């Protein structure tokens, strides 16, 4: 399908994003759910999918990790099924992501869907990331509190919650409504009628993850192999001392390495292009030869990107799922990065180059793009 | 005994250290060996001690590792035995380290001893570390090359090398010292039965700094702050990552690194650790603080465990991967400055109970022993 967002973007980015939560009423007009609770359940039965059941009985909370062989015995009440990264396994669901391209592809994460019977829900909780929560069929009561430091507690080892909060937002969401929550704002919501919620999640790294990742990149690629050297080595009163100048030199090594021109860009390119959830990956059973891709495309057949596969451009280099793609043909690479559903027109003269055709062949044979 | 290096130190550090290799003729006058070859073999058989044995049947070599038994077996000619960190074990060998205190404690590693029967040698190897090779008990032929300078390929470190043209070729007598910087290919082998005492040095490369610091960051779970973009910049293509964003991220990292306390503490814990296993046997019954106090004021002498690294950063003291929590700058400064302390070395600090409780804990860790 194709989904149309009624949001006013400049106003939102200016006043709201990464600042304050909002309820965007009728974000989607005449909202038609991309998927059904049944299709979602069947999808949760699959073993490659990350899914979980969260139920609560009076005070007690029970969290069960999927997949599942059974719809019984659950209840008419007080439970919810959560499925991560549906946009990987379902194309119509993947369509929901497109309207959010007004925000950077690299910051966006994936689409997680929850189905809840009345009373069903995940409880009050905090996130470290921005989220858009889209109301599907049914209705839920959503509550968001002010952003204040609060202790996280665990009703279950597998389930994070906070203490109940005074809501700065308390509302019932109709289908098509969207609730934007910046990180740090406690929120809770629960089904009134049988409900479907679509969370477009976002991702941002912290410093720990960055320095760790890059350290592993340096180790793996065997970089930064230059040793500390002191032909000028300074005198000292006490031989057990390590002088401030030496510490400074030592750290200056790390800073210098971090600032080496290609290395950081390349590492981050390989990192950020990787998905936090498992892709659906099925390399073409026989591999493709370059000229049947050439032919297929020229024959009118269309190339489409695997749902959830991240393609990002940093400078003149492109990165698809951890792998750097480097080609002299810019329009083609731009076509690969900024739109799914590619046709020969988007490639231009690139297909004539056997090198580009070879690369493209390797990308398709990898499962990253497939024919329609 | 207690060794006196005859060396012009200003001239060495100025013209030589980390620059050019030299043969220092009669680096030691009347050089008596700290240890006998059979004693060395006595250590070569041990569970904890790191040894190795290298033999060349011409054109081909064989290497075995410790512990050891039955040296016959075989060999008369053409083999060598090598033992790491002998100063961690044999106390008079650690005294051979004292003259090199003219160089920083943090850059010094340890002393390895190699006994080679005639023809015995390790082959033309290469190091990324500085080394002083002290000749004793017999003679060896040493040759040192010109340090070739492999574009963008990692240096293999200790991996073996080419039959170089020698900028240095000679035969060492007892007391002779061959200093080599990192990068200079070198080979040596025994003529008469030969003892070599190689005092080595250690430097971190950038990779080790970044890995260590990263691990430390994970452990204390620091840098928890998340990248945020209230102002997030517009772009032509939704798939693009702008330079200003890359700068945001990079500066997050640089900021974490330039936080002084964390880097300081981590490195203090990192550099105070030893590259080889120490001898650690805490007193079977411990000492009460009063026992320490008393015995210490009886004129007894505490000595730092051989090979144990104690280093000062700012005013902070680190002993074997751990900080020492304490005031009394003179006393801790003494703990780092002198191996073999006395009551006079501490002075006033002994009357503070909180101080000697700590010190007693140091002794009980096995980091200092009486003699
Ligand atoms: Mn309840
Ligand atoms: Mn072109
Ligand atoms: Mn000199
Ligand atoms: Mn060497």
Swiss-Prot record, chain A:
<keyword id="KW-0408">Iron</keyword>
<comment type="subunit">
    <text>Homodimer.</text>
</comment>
<comment type="function">
    <text>Growth-regulating oxygenase that catalyzes the hydroxylation of ribosomal protein uL16 on 'Arg-81'.</text>
</comment>
<dbReference type="GO" id="GO:0008198">
    <property type="term" value="F:ferrous iron binding"/>
</dbReference>
<feature type="binding site">
    <location>
        <position position="187"/>
    </location>
    <ligand>
        <name>Fe cation</name>
    </ligand>
</feature>
<dbReference type="InterPro" id="IPR003347">
    <property type="entry name" value="JmjC_dom"/>
</dbReference>
<dbReference type="InterPro" id="IPR039994">
    <property type="entry name" value="NO66-like"/>
</dbReference>
<feature type="binding site">
    <location>
        <position position="140"/>
    </location>
    <ligand>
        <name>substrate</name>
    </ligand>
</feature>
<protein>
    <recommendedName>
        <fullName>Ribosomal protein uL16 3-hydroxylase</fullName>
        <ecNumber>1.14.11.47</ecNumber>
    </recommendedName>
</protein>
<dbReference type="Pfam" id="PF20514">
    <property type="entry name" value="ROXA-like_wH"/>
</dbReference>
<feature type="binding site">
    <location>
        <position position="114"/>
    </location>
    <ligand>
        <name>substrate</name>
    </ligand>
</feature>
<keyword id="KW-0223">Dioxygenase</keyword>
<dbReference type="GO" id="GO:0043687">
    <property type="term" value="P:post-translational protein modification"/>
</dbReference>
<dbReference type="InterPro" id="IPR046799">
    <property type="entry name" value="ROXA-like_wH"/>
</dbReference>
<feature type="binding site">
    <location>
        <begin position="125"/>
        <end position="127"/>
    </location>
    <ligand>
        <name>substrate</name>
    </ligand>
</feature>
<dbReference type="Pfam" id="PF08007">
    <property type="entry name" value="JmjC_2"/>
</dbReference>
<comment type="similarity">
    <text>Belongs to the ROX family. RoxA/YcfD subfamily.</text>
</comment>
<feature type="domain" description="JmjC">
    <location>
        <begin position="92"/>
        <end position="219"/>
    </location>
</feature>
<feature type="binding site">
    <location>
        <position position="127"/>
    </location>
    <ligand>
        <name>Fe cation</name>
    </ligand>
</feature>
<keyword id="KW-0479">Metal-binding</keyword>
<feature type="binding site">
    <location>
        <position position="187"/>
    </location>
    <ligand>
        <name>substrate</name>
    </ligand>
</feature>
<dbReference type="GO" id="GO:0016706">
    <property type="term" value="F:2-oxoglutarate-dependent dioxygenase activity"/>
</dbReference>
<keyword id="KW-0560">Oxidoreductase</keyword>
<dbReference type="GO" id="GO:0042803">
    <property type="term" value="F:protein homodimerization activity"/>
</dbReference>
<feature type="binding site">
    <location>
        <position position="125"/>
    </location>
    <ligand>
        <name>Fe cation</name>
    </ligand>
</feature>
């Amino acid at each position: 399908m194709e989904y149309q967002l009624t949001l006013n973007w400049p106003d939102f980015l200016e006043r709201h994003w990464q600042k304050r939560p909002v309820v965007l009423k009728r974000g989607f007009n005449n909202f038609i759910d991309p998927i059904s609770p049944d299709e979602l359940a069947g999808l949760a039965m699959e073993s490659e999918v990350d899914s979980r059941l969260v139920s609560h009985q009076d005070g007690k909370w029970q969290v069960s990790h999927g997949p599942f062989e059974s719809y019984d015995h659950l209840g008419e009440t007080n439970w919810s099924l959560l499925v991560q990264a549906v946009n990987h396994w379902h194309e119509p669901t993947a369509a929901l992501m497109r309207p959010f391209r007004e925000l950077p592809d690299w910051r966006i994460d994936d689409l997680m869907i929850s189905f809840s019977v009345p009373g069903g829900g995940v409880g009050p909780h905090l996130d470290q990331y921005d989220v858009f929560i889209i109301q599907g069929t049914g209705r839920r009561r959503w509550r968001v509190g002010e952003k204040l430091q609060m202790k996280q507690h665990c009703p279950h080892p597998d389930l994070l919650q906070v203490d109940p909060f005074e809501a700065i937002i308390d509302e019932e969401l109709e289908p098509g409504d969207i609730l934007y929550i910046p990180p740090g704002f406690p929120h809770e919501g629960y089904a009134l009628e049988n409900a479907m919620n679509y969370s477009v999640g976002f991702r941002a790294p912290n410093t720990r993850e960055l320095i760790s990742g890059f350290a592993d990149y340096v180790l793996q690629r065997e970089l930064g192999g230059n040793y500390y050297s002191d032909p000028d080595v300074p005198p000292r009163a006490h031989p057990a001392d390590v002088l401030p100048q030496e510490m400074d030199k030592l750290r200056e090594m790390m800073l210098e390495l971090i600032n080496q021109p290609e290395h950081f860009k390349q590492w981050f390119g390989e990192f950020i292009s990787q998905s936090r959830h498992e892709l659906d990956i099925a390399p073409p059973e026989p591999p493709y030869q370059p000229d049947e891709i050439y032919d297929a495309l020229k024959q009118g057949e269309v190339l489409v990107r695997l749902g959830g596969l991240r393609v990002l451009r940093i400078g003149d280099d492109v990165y698809a799922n951890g792998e750097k793609i480097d080609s002299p043909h810019r329009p083609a690479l731009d076509a690969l990065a900024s739109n799914i559903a590619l046709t020969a027109e988007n490639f231009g003269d690139a297909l004539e180059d056997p090198s580009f055709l070879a690369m493209l062949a390797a990308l398709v044979n990898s499962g990253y793009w497939f024919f329609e």
